[PDB]
């Protein structure tokens, strides 16, 4: 995500459904991060165990 | 038994002789020195 | 499957896939060892090149196993063992050399082991060996720092007393033997079935029922020495002392530079916790319940952030000037009536100092006169002021470098026979003598190494070595009563004599900062940067000096060509060199107020001690005492006055310095423990502001 | 605003 | 001079937040 | 490059003792990737002119001492 | 004359242990002899490179003891 | 090599001057080269490392 | 440079080339 | 420069929340 925001544009050469930059490596990730969040700052809360020290 | 690991590093090394009665503050310790006339 | 960006960089390149107790105790055989035993062998046997023991193999191959199969039925008494352990090698090592020669922890923890039982009756990591080092210092030299930390466990467990009974001695005992149980916490015996894990009758002796490892639980971090330095304290002992020993522990690790810069800092922090000069010598007193001196200690490991603080400096002032007699300098009135005195006094020595050596060793009350002083510095008793016996050795070390150099501008061949026994020439021989019988009793007397760091201890010597060795070859060579050779050498030593004296002369700035931190400058690039480089330059030079004569053996363009070489590389080194005095001058310029205070406390310390005589009179002064004892001291005064005043006090002075020390430094140990808790806030941050920003 | 005061906290409570 | 103050000491501050 | 460096160097120094210096610069089955190798390879200076990588070259090179039988 | 003084104060033992830690490697990897005998006729550097069995087991707990107590460090500095 | 061929055809100032030429070339790299005894000396290998920087 | 470092420099070469000078003039006679 | 607003405030922020505490 990184590289797709120094994408940001180039609708690539014609209306084709403006295929972000990175659409299909994005999508093949198995990430949520509004489910990566809740279950670290939360485990953070119990002083550790959320992934390694 | 006697030298316990720094007793022979540290320990005030030679055989001091006591004095039956010497003080050691900054006065009545200098009598040997000056008078008491 | 291909490797990826990292995997082909990163990843490993290459595609990997007799008898007689010698061999039977370096394999490890516990079964063999014993069968050859039974029908009867030497378990002492000696193999010749290299004096290695049948039992000192199985502490070298780390099998244990062996030694402790030996302790079942092949020893007696407590002794023989002993006999066993320590039998030698032939460089000089025994069993906890070899084992500490190369890291073997699982051995090492074994002689520890029956160290800490009592199995042996000697000291066995405390011996030396052939080449001087220890126990200690062998796993130091090669580096094995798993074992190290092994010796440095135990010598701090024996720092702590057996004897004491207190909760905080005997909880930071037992918690230094489980952790050398732990860290053996495997390795059983050799029979197998036995409830004996390495470390039980240790753990047994001591007096303490308790009621994911991370790295802090399994080494020596500071946390574990502030709690030996209290819990020493506990016990009663120097809390300047345990400081001073536990740093010359850590420091002969030379793996723990970490702890080495704590415990540093912790006796300047401890020094500065005193007020004035009664608090000073009181946690500095070797009274007599433990009596240790650390001011005698820390000039004997030289301790420079000890020896150079300023209250350091101030308890040797007291005693070696007490009258500002080193600052009639800074004015304007103190140099011309000040320095008039001096050469009025020291003319009044010069003429009463012989008179009063020959009355001092004889049955005389003036013996008693010269030590009625010395309690009291002052200008009624001026002999026991040691500024006034240094500045009377520096004006009779003065005037032997102007008697030799008036030697050397009125000379010449022209001289009768009467010039080898000469009024002059005789007289500044046993000068020479008195100083090499000087240099003899101050090596004896202080020991090896405390004589020979100061630097100019090599220049006593060979100035009385180079005139020596001209007096005698005047009467040996030159024309008095012998034969003609070539005697450019008689001349020659007398400038050998006359170089080095004018040189010894720079040692009157001992004192006087801003002239006296130059001229340890001056003999810290000498002794590392002049006999270094001219070593790296001399295999250069015979590279020149032999590849000149290669081309001139058979033109211009030959040797112009080989001229720039010689005009480039002299600058390419003369390049390195400006830089590497510019390199020491910058490394002892930012600690010329420590170099030159430590410096100036070894002689206020030297001084203090000695006789305010000989100069020239270890001649005149050693050969009556002793005659007055044929018919007391000659050299025994130095070491019976204990180097100062407020030592051992008698009485209830005693009761009042111990009672000053205990708000001392019970007013230090609890500014550590307020140090430290915030270094364990200090690595809990986002632990705090993630509950600061929750409750909020 | 206290020309010589300011807030303080306490550096105690260790071991 | 409260720089010097809350640089040397701030693990006492975030200390006496918690209680 | 000036964190890295001086993150290389603050885990050396996080070992206290030989055994866990050669924990983490030992190549096992699993992750068989060498690290000392690698600093041999791009010339590493603020990782092999470290006091407890120093040392673990000269208990392969020397192992008996022969370097200390000098300061006599 | 200030351009090795900048190099010699700074990074001079530095340029020292590194170039003897390439002298004591580059004999763990040799093979046989010098220049002499050499015309008149994949292994590893270290011992303790790759544990097999027990050996493994400990270097794999030692490891998480010193790392996870590095990044725990580099987390609050 | 070339004092071989110093019994052929005499130059003797094309030939045999660079004949002498080589062998202190030969002799001012081996001594500079006999500088790398000390490199595992300390207090003598930072002046080698210095000299080679 | 007149201040501070003269007067503690010109002391200290002063007792070296007096030393040089000695030992020169005990190697020309 | 809203933090030098706040820089050269902080004995009165730090008394603030050494009173609310
Ligand atoms: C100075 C004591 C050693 C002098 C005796 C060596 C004479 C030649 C011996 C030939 C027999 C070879 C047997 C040993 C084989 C070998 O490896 O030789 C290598 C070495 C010799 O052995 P080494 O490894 O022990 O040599 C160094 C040396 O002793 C350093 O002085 C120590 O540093 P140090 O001054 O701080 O104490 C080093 O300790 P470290 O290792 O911890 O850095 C040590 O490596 O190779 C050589 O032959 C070089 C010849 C050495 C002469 C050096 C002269 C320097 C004089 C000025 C230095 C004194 C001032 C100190 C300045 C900080
Ligand atoms: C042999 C032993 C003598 C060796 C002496 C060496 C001294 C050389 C260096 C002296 C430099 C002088 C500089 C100076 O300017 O120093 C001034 C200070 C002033 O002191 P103050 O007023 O600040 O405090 C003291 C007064 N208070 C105690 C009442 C508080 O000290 C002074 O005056 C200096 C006066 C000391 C010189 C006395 C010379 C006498 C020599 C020999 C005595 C002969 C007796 C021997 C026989 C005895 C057996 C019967
Ligand atoms: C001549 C003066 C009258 C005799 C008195 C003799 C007293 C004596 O010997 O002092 C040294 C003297 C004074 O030098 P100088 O003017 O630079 O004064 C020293 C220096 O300036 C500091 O003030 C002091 O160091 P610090 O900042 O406080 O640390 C130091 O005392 P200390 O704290 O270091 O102890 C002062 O002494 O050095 C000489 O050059 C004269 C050599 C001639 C020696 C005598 C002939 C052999």
Not at chain 3, 22 to 48: H, N, P, S
Not at chain 3, 377 to 385: L, T
Not at chain 3, 463 to 473: C, D, Q, R
Not at chain 3, 561 to 589: E, G, P, Q
Request: aromatic share 10%.
């Amino acid at each position: 995500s990184l590289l797709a925001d120094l994408a940001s544009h180039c609708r690539d050469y014609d209306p084709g459904c403006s295929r972000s930059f990175f659409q299909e490596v994005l999508a093949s990730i198995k990430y949520d991060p509004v489910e990566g969040a809740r279950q670290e700052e939360a485990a953070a809360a119990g002083g550790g165990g959320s992934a390694r020290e | 038994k006697k030298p316990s690991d720094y007793g022979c590093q540290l320990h005030y090394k030679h055989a001091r002789v006591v004095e039956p009665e010497s003080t050691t503050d900054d006065g009545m310790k200098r009598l040997k020195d000056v008078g008491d006339k | 499957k291909k490797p990826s960006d990292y995997g082909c960089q990163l990843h490993y390149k290459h595609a990997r896939v007799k008898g007689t107790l010698i061999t039977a105790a370096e394999l490890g055989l516990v079964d063999k060892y014993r069968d050859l035993k039974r029908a009867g062998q030497d378990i002492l046997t000696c193999d010749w090149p290299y004096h290695y023991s049948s039992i000192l193999y199985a502490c070298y191959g780390n099998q244990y196993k062996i030694l402790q199969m030996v302790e079942r039925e092949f020893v007696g008494s407590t002794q023989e063992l002993t006999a066993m352990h320590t039998t030698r090698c032939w460089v000089g090592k025994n069993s906890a050399m070899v084992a500490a020669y190369q890291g073997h922890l699982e051995t090492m923890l074994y002689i520890i082991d029956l160290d800490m039982q009592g199995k042996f009756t000697e000291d066995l990591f405390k011996q030396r060996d052939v080449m001087g080092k220890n126990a200690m210092m062998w796993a130091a030299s090669q580096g094995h720092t798993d074992t190290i930390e092994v010796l440095l466990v135990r010598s701090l467990y024996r720092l702590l007393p057996e004897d004491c009974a207190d909760p905080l001695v005997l909880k930071t005992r037992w918690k230094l033997v489980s952790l050398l149980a732990d860290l053996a916490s495997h390795c059983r015996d050799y029979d197998p079935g036995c409830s004996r894990s390495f470390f039980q009758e240790v753990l047994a002796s001591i007096k303490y029922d308790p009621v994911a490892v991370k790295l802090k639980d399994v080494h020596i971090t500071v946390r574990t020495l502030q709690g030996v330095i209290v819990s020493a304290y506990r016990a009663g002992m120097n809390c300047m002392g345990v400081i001073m020993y536990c740093q010359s522990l850590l420091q002969q690790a030379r793996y723990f530079d970490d702890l080495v810069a704590q415990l540093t800092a912790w006796e300047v922090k401890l020094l500065d916790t005193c007020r004035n000069k009664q608090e000073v010598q009181a946690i500095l007193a070797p009274t007599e319940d433990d009596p240790s001196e650390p001011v005698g200690y820390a000039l004997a490991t030289f301790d420079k952030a000890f020896l150079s603080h300023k209250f350091v400096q101030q308890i040797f002032t007291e005693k070696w000037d007490t009258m500002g007699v080193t600052d009639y300098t800074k004015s304007l009135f103190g140099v011309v009536w000040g320095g008039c005195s001096l050469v009025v006094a020291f003319a009044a020595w010069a003429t009463i100092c012989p008179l009063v050596v020959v009355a001092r060793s004889f049955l005389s009350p003036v013996q008693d006169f010269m030590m009625r002083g010395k309690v009291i510095v002052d200008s009624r008793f001026p002999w026991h002021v040691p500024l006034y016996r240094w500045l009377l050795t520096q004006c009779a070390l003065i005037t032997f470098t102007v008697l030799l150099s008036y030697l050397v501008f009125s000379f010449d061949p022209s001289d009768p026979v009467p010039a080898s026994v000469a009024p002059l020439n005789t007289f500044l021989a046993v000068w020479c003598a008195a100083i090499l019988v000087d240099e003899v009793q101050e090596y004896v007397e202080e020991g090896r190494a405390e004589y020979m760091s100061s630097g100019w201890n090599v220049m006593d010597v060979t100035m009385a070595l180079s005139y020596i060795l001209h007096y005698i070859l005047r009467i040996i060579a030159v024309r008095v009563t012998d034969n003609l050779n070539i005697l450019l050498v008689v001349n020659d030593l007398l400038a050998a004599a006359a170089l080095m004296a004018w040189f010894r002369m720079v040692s009157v700035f001992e004192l006087s900062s801003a002239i006296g931190p130059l001229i340890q400058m001056m003999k810290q690039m000498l002794i590392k940067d002049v006999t270094r480089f001219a070593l790296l330059v001399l295999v250069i030079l015979l590279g020149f000096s032999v590849g000149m004569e290669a081309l001139f053996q058979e033109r211009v363009t030959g040797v112009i060509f080989y001229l720039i070489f010689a005009i480039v590389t002299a600058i390419l080194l003369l390049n390195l060199f400006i830089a590497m005095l510019a390199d020491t001058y910058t490394r002892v310029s930012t600690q010329a107020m420590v170099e030159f205070r430590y410096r100036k406390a070894k002689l206020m310390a030297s001084y203090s001690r000695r006789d305010f005589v000989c100069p020239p009179f270890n001649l005149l002064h050693l050969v009556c005492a002793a005659v007055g004892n044929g018919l007391p001291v000659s050299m025994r005064k130095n070491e019976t006055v204990p180097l100062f005043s407020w030592y051992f006090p008698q009485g209830e002075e005693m009761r009042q310095v111990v009672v000053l020390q205990r708000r001392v430094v019970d007013d230090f140990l609890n500014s550590n423990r307020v140090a430290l808790f915030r270094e364990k806030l200090n690595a809990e941050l986002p632990n705090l502001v993630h509950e600061m920003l929750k409750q909020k | 605003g206290a020309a010589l005061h300011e807030p303080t906290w306490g550096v105690d409570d260790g071991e």
